[PDB]
Every structure is written in structure tokens, then in C-alpha cells.
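User: These chains co-purify. Model them together.
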Amino acid sequence: MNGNSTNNEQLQQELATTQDQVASIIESFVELGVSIYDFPGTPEATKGMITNLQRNVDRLYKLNVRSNDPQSSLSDIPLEVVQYIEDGRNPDIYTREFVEAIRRSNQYQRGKMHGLKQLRDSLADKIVDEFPELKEPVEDIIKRTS
Amino acid sequence: QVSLALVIRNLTVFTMKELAQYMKTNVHTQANEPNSAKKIRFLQLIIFLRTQFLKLYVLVKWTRTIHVLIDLLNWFRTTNMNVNNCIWALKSSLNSMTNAK
Amino acid sequence: YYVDPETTYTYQQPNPLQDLISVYGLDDISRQVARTNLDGTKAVKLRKSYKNQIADLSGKFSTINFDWDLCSSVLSQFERS
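Assistant: Joint model of the three components:
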């Protein structure tokens, strides 16, 4: 029990660190774009642009190196999820409808199981009734099924 | 199952290749083109790369939230089309065996 | 004829009759993204895509071998011109 909790905590910490690093990368890219749009052409601005580019490259390299660690806890995303997330929204209706379909399938399964159970119970009862000589195997049939 | 590390490595390789191609194209592009257009193209490329990295960020956040719901979801789906396949197999068996009737 | 006492069929595991969500303690995430709360009221507004997961970050998302030093120097020379 303690090992699973420790593994979960380590995975959460690693994912939080990755999230923070990627957020910093995104902020640096936003700053880079802002500087490019409002570039004055001064040598100091050029040096700042070079430093920002180097920092972005170093951050990307560090993220690639850390995320590729075989010992990292990071090591499924279906293509349908990627297709659904391309619609500019908050990702809930896909899960809602597909879980609704899942629940409908489960309810169908339970209802058909109950129906089949009553079917074979009634059939066993009547086979015992009109055919007492076959009563003994029928119960064994239940033992063979249940 | 696709490893997240492999996806991240592929995305980084694609980003590096795109950046190298853009730098090369800027290198052999004639100097007659205004620097404003090149700056705009570089900004657009940076925005696209940032969007890809933000998609990776969203995937990382989802994995941080992560599989329990995914595992239940996949198991219930497997049960559903297994039942459907059993129904179709029953129908096919009756269609085939009607000849022997 | 086919009644074989040696042939015994076991129950399918897990049993679909039982609550398969709670078999492995898998109710936390289901409750987190449940359609409705315990009182039946809507918890959160529902939508389709990942856009609202990036709204907290700055920006306007209206529509949704290699020498780095040499490239940086080339960009610097181009910008200074």
C-alpha cells in the first residue's frame, strides 16, 4: 500500500515539474513573440533576443532530455480524442455522451442477464414439471452454468 | 499503448527539423524580401510551435490527472462489442444452419 | 449424453452483475466527472475541446548537426540591418 502511494506521489511530482517547465517555456515563447513584434533594432534589444532564443533552446533541450529518461515515472491518447479536442471548447461533452453510451450498454447487459436468468429458471422448472425423469441432470445443468 | 516519452521525443525532433528548415530557407532567401515579412513568418512559426508545445502541456496535465476512468471505459467498450459480436455470430450461425434444417 | 460431471464452468470474472466501478475502487474519477451531482443538479458547464484548459495562460486564443549559435548570429545580423 505504501509503495503504490509513494509511486503515485513521485509521478505527480514529476508531472508537476514537467507542467511548470512547459508553462515557463510557453511564457518565454510569448515574451519572444512580443519582443519580435515590438523589436526596436537596438543592439541591446538584439542581445536580449539572442539571450531569449538561447534560453528557449536550452529549456526545450532540458525538457526533451528529462522527458526521455527511461527511469522516469512518465514512461493512452486515442486519435479520436485529438480530433475531438480541435473544436475550441472545454472537454466534457465527449466524455458525458460516451459515458452515457457506456451506462446504456451496462444497463442493457444487466437487463439481458436478468431476462436470461428468468428464462432458464422457468425452463428448468417446467422441464422438471413435465419431465421428472430428467430433473436430476437439469439441476446439474445449473451447477454446470452457475 | 504509446509511450509519452516517445511522443515527446518525436515532437521535439519535428520542432528541431522545422526550425532548421526555416533557418535554411531564410539563409537562401534573396535579400530583396523585406525583413518585416521574414519576422512575421518567424513569429507565425514560433506561435505554431508554442501551440504544439501547449497541446503537449495539455496532454501532460491530463496524464497528471490520470487511467482509472480510461480502464473502466475500455473494459466496458470491450464487453459491449463482444456482446455485439456474439449476437452477430448467433445470427450468422442460424443463417448458415437454416440450410441444414 | 453430453452431461459431463467432470466439466465444470466457473463464474466469469469480474461479474457484470456486481458494481464493476467499485470492484477496484474506481469511483473517484467517475464522481469527479459525473454527469450530475448527488442532488441531480449540474455541476459544471460541459463542452467539447481542450481550449478552456489554456484560458488561464496569457494570450487570445480566438481561433483553435544543428548550430544554434550560427542561426542566432544570422538572425541578429538580419534584424540589425
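DSSP finds three helices and no strands in chain C.
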